[PDB]
Amino acid sequence: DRVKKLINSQISLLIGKGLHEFDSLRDPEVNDFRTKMRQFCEEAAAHRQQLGWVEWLQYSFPLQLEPSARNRALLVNVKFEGSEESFTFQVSTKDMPLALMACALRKKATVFRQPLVEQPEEYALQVNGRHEYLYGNYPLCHFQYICSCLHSGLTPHLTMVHSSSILAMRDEQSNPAPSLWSLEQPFSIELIEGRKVNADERMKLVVQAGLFHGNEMLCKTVSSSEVNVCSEPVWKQRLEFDISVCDLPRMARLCFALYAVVDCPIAWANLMLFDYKDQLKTGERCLYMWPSVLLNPAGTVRGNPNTESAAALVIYLPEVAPHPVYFPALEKILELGRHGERGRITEEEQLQLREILERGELYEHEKDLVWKMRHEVQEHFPEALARLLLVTKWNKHEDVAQMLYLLCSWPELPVLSALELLDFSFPDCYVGSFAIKSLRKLTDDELFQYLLQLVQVLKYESYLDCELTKFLLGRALANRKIGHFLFWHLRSEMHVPSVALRFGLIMEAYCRGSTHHMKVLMKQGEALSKLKALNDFVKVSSQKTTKPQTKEMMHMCMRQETYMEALSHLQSPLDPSTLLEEVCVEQCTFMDSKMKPLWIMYSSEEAGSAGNVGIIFKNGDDLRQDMLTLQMIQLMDVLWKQEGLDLRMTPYGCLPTGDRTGLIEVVLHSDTIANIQLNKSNMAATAAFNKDALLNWLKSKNPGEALDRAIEEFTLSCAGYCVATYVLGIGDRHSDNIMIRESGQLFHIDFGHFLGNRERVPFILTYDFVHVIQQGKTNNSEKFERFRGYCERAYTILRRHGLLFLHLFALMRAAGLPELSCSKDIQYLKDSLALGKTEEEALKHFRVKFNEALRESWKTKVN
Numbered sequence: 036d037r038v039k040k041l042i043n044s045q046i047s048l049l050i051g052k053g054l055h056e057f058d059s060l061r062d063p064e065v066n067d068f069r070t071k072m073r074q075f076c077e078e079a080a081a082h083r084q085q086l087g088w089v090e091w092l093q094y095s096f097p098l099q100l101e102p103s104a105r106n107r108a109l110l111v112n113v114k115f116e117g118s119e120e121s122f123t124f125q126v127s128t129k130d131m132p133l134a135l136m137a138c139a140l141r142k143k144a145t146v147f148r149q150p151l152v153e154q155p156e157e158y159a160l161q162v163n164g165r166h167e168y169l170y171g172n173y174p175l176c177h178f179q180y181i182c183s184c185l186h187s188g189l190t191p192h193l194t195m196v197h198s199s200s201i202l203a204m205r206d207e208q209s210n211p212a213p214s215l216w217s218l219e220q221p222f223s224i225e226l227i228e229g230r231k232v233n234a235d236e237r238m239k240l241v242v243q244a245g246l247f248h249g250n251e252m253l254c255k256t257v258s259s260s261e262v263n264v265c266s267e268p269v270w271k272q273r274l275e276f277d278i279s280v281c282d283l284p285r286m287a288r289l290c291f292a293l294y295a296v297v298d299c300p301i302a303w304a305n306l307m308l309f310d311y312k313d314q315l316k317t318g319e320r321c322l323y324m325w326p327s328v329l330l331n332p333a334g335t336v337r338g339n340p341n342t343e344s345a346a347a348l349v350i351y352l353p354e355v356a357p358h359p360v361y362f363p364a365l366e367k368i369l370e371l372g373r374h375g376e377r378g379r380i381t382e383e384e385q386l387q388l389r390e391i392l393e394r395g396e397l398y399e400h401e402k403d404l405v406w407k408m409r410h411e412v413q414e415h416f417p418e419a420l421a422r423l424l425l426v427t428k429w430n431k432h433e434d435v436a437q438m439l440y441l442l443c444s445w446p447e448l449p450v451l452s453a454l455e456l457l458d459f460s461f462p463d464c465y466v467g468s469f470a471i472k473s474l475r476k477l478t479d480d481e482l483f484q485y486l487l488q489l490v491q492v493l494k495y496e497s498y499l500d501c502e503l504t505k506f507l508l509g510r511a512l513a514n515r516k517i518g519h520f521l522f523w524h525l526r527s528e529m530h531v532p533s534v535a536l537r538f539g540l541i542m543e544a545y546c547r548g549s550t551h552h553m554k555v556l557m558k559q560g561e562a563l564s565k566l567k568a569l570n571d572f573v574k575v576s577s578q579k580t581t582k583p584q585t586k587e588m589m590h591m592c593m594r595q596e597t598y599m600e601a602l603s604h605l606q607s608p609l610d611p612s613t614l615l616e617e618v619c620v621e622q623c624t625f626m627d628s629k630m631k632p633l634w635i636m637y638s639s640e641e642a643g644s645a646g647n648v649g650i651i652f653k654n655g656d657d658l659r660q661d662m663l664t665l666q667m668i669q670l671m672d673v674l675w676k677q678e679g680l681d682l683r684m685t686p687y688g689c690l691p692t693g694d695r696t697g698l699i700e701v702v703l704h705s706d707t708i709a710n711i712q713l714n715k716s717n718m719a720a721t722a723a724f725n726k727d728a729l730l731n732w733l734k735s736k737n738p739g740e741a742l743d744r745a746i747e748e749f750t751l752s753c754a755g756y757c758v759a760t761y762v763l764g765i766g767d768r769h770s771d772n773i774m775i776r777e778s779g780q781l782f783h784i785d786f787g788h789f790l791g792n793r794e795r796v797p798f799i800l801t802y803d804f805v806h807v808i809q810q811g812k813t814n815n816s817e818k819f820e821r822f823r824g825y826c827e828r829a830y831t832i833l834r835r836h837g838l839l840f841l842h843l844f845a846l847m848r849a850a851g852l853p854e855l856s857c858s859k860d861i862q863y864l865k866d867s868l869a870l871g872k873t874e875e876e877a878l879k880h881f882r883v884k885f886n887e888a889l890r891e892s893w894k895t896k897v898n
């Protein structure tokens with residue numbers, strides 16, 4: 036069909052990889068993944084196009100509620116769809132959207148002299164010119180939009196939208212018309228030869244081979260004989276391992292490292308001993324190697340796609356049996372594991388077992404006791420599953436069967452425990468499947484919070500068709516915001532060969548489940564394409580002429596029909612609720628920094644003042660660490676708000692979209708501390724002492740009694756960013772990467788470095804900010820110590836969630852970020868949070884750290 040042909044080509048251009056490329060690999064695993072996930076996603080699409088109108092609002096416009104939500108007078112402007120006539124009426128912040136709706140309908144029934152057929156139940160309230168709605172049984176104050184409006188002071192502008200208008204949205208966005216355990220001999224392989232090997236001729240080539248189950252060795256590593264350096268080395272030798280074939284676990288991976296010696300790392304390659312269909316692999320394998328930068332268990336189990344240039348090791352998996360051998364079914368495993376003597380020892384060991392299960396590495400005796408008392412772990416200490424899993428001998432078929440028997444009847448664990456279990460330290464497929472089962476209870480807001488880390492876990496996966504991929508696919512198809520960000524997280528890494536096939540396959544499947552959103556996403560990709568072209572021009576022009584010259588030329592380029600069409604009328608990749616309507620060419624510019632980032636401004640008549648939004652397009656820098664930093668600061672703000680603490684944070688959007696490409700949300704009405712401190716003449720802020728400048732700027736933006744609120748907003752945000760930077764080890768902080776909103780809110784930009792990269796980042800307190808907290812007065816202990824009280828409260832809240840930060844940072848090790856590549860980087864978080872201490876101990880350690888930062892600050896106060 037011609038419709039099927041166009042969608043296939045639109046998916047090809049969207050994901051940046053031709054679908055013909057999947058067919059050309061002729062791999063049954065890819066073929067089975069494509070068929071099964073296409074069928075799964077098309078089923079979700081069929082379920083969706085029949086949702087009820089409120090359920091469809093829940094899919095397309097998921098509610099944006101305050102972390103607290105999951106009295107005071109309020110003024111709201113309401114209009115009915117299309118009609119310019121609006122009504123401004125006074126409601127309460129504790130009133131429900133329904134009372135606001137009944138209120139709007141009585142007005143409409145009086146202005147147009149008619150009794151209305153419609154009940155307030157037939158409507159939803161759209162936030163003007165935004166893909167955002169207020170509905171459900173929540174007070175208005177609980178909504179992020181109203182909450183935002185209350186804190187700024189602006190009047191909420193809403194539109195009454197009927198059930199028929201949303202059902203038409205549902206309808207118009209529709210998809211088109213239609214045995215192993217007897218094998219006791221040692222595992223061995225023949226190392227045949229190597230191809231296209233590049234190394235110094237004076238050296239010899241060595242091939243190191245290891246058997247792993249995640250990070251753990253299953254036996255000793257074995258090395259081949261040393262053979263002279265040349266293009267095609269020949270070994271033709273048998274490498275025998277210290278593990279029987281029966282003892283190989285399901286997720287065992289054979290890892291190879293090729294290097295040179297007189298060590299000179301050349302390349303590495305890994306493969307799974309069992310295939311996607313549970314069969315024990317046999318015959319020849321050509322391993323297209325990845326060039327090193329020595330065994331890499333965490334590395335991908337798929338070969339290098341660049342067959343032309345990659346080094347290629349040829350190996351032979353021996354035929355251990357005349358007929359094919361598959362991993363035993365769960366039915367056999369449980370039968371073997373059903374047999375085991377129950378641990379029945381004294382009260383002495385019970386107190387000793389309690390001590391370590393509630394407690395980090397264990398001793399040989401501590402491990403043996405946990406294993407012996409495994410039945411008691413299931414029944415009395417279920418949350419110690421991860422401890423029990425780490426002591427299990429994964430190199431023993433009998434021990435694995437006994438662990439798996441307990442797991443299959445293990446109670447579901449909290450979301451926090453499940454997050455720990457997705458770590459590469461837990462590579463078992465049944466463990467992985469258990470971890471997902473416990474994560475099904477995640478809310479969409481919680482899933483959204485951890486989506487970034489979940490997408491990184493996909494890089495650990497041994498097969499394409501996996502439980503985590505199906506989970507993410509199902510949830511993405513069930514929530515448009517989830518769908519939007521899952522797409523971008525994957526799309527932004529299509530330039531990385533190790534993930535391009537897996538990510539491309541997930542994105543294709545998603546597109547099969549939502550034809551309309553694929554087109555919505557293509558419109559975003561067309562804008563990004565133009566921004567790249569425009570940014571390339573600016574980069575060249577900025578080196579050949581003056582700034583007004585490049586800016587005027589940039590404008591001419593944007594004003595072209597092609598650019599005006601592509602850059603306007605799209606959902607924002609930073610936030611699909613944000614609609615970027617009319618590009619305001621005259622307000623567009625570029626920044627003076629290395630990559631000359633573009634500064635793009637938008638307007639929307641329908642949204643009014645809220646439709647005025649900016650995006651920064653930046654090309655040449657990996658923005659993944661910046662996004663992780665901002666997402667961690669956003670989590671801090673959520674955890675603080677859950678404890679009733681609002682530190683007036685600015686968690687602006689940051690999204691990588693391509694190879695060293697991404698967008699940054701513009702926070703309007705904000706300026707850098709560096710600019711304010713330049714202390715320009717002929718301005719309201721013009722100071723007598725440079726220390727007076729921020730406060731003078733604050734005064735000019737906040738006249739009269741508004742100044743008290745601005746100092747408080749500054750104080751709160753300062754406390755939050757001081758704690759955020761200290762906990763995350765955010766260094767290289769100066770007046771040009773610190774910004775201030777006209778409300779007084781302090782926020783940080785461009786997170787180039789974190790986790791103290793390795794020098795331990797000290798707590799930072801700077802006099803000019805102490806000067807605003809203290810209201811300009813030289814001595815204001817009342818104000819300063821109230822700030823120290825805000826810092827201390829924010830710190831102890833993060834500590835109570837110390838394990839959530841460690842589990843998320845652990846899953847992030849999969850991302851491949853230079854400042855997050857091992858255990859040293861995580862030790863920074865463990866140290867900054869002081870989780871190996873008591874609250875009184877860590878608080879005193881924080882107070883000593885803060886006091887040390889006040890003493891360093893006081894060196895500037897002496898002058």
Ligand SMILES: Oc1cccc(-c2cccc(N3CCOCC3)n2)c1
Binds near residue numbers: 689700701702705784
């Ligand atoms: O997270 C980053 C990464 C790189 C650059 C920036 C950056 C640089 C200048 C301005 C700017 N902001 C955005 C927020 O709104 C004010 C301008 N962000 C932020």
